[PDB]
Amino acid sequence: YLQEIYNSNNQKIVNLKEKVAQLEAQCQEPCKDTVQIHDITGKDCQDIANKGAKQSGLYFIKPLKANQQFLVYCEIDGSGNGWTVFQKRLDGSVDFKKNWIQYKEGFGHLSPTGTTEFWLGNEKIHLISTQSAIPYALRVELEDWNGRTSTADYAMFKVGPEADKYRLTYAYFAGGDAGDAFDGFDFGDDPSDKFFTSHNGMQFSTWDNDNDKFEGNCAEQDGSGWWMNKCHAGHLNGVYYQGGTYSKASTPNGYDNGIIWATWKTRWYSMKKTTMKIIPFNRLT
């Protein structure tokens, strides 16, 4: 009627302004980020497990040599071993055709679920592997397109300083069903084959920084960053080919440039998943 409906909605207002306030309170916190970094730190992933870490995830570390901490992905098993993963492949998400700097500082993404591709920097790998007298072991996990997996361990795995172009060194092949590709492969014909495809003692190479034992540029030709020697027998930072199998037709320069491990599969077969990780030798046996 007269002054009725006016005060009707008018009385409704004050209470509404109250609902708003209550609403305002509900909208102050940002979206929850599923990614989380644990509180524990250490010389490496193993060191962390020793401190009671019971889950594979992201952690910060600072090798005795490092003067700045950095994030890494630690794979922790039930036995209590802390693996420090420095390389991982799953899908063709990341382009491993990166330059020297990128390979030095690293590229890709770190995930607590370990479901992401990356290359921790070479400089980081260096600082870790050589941070102390304690020898490290490098394990290489490979998985084909049929779910089958294999491994390969290398004792006294060490990566040299940038001054020595992050040379890959290791005392010996500690064993594994995947076979020792780091020792070269006898690809038939020419006898120099196995010799010229071995990786021990090789320096790292990128398209913009040729350090291979090839008059040409293995890295530019295969589009990757790896320890090349008149190319390779083991090539984990290679081109991700869907399905695994591929022909030289598929390839650009006409050479095998996929993720290969000659001792486990033909060079015309590229892996589905890949993992390079290290742990102090002592944990093994």
């Binding site: 690809f187 010229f196 293995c218 190319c231 027998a233 050479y255 095998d256």
Partner: peptide
Amino acid sequence: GHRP
């Protein structure tokens, strides 16, 4: 691979 190799480079002959």
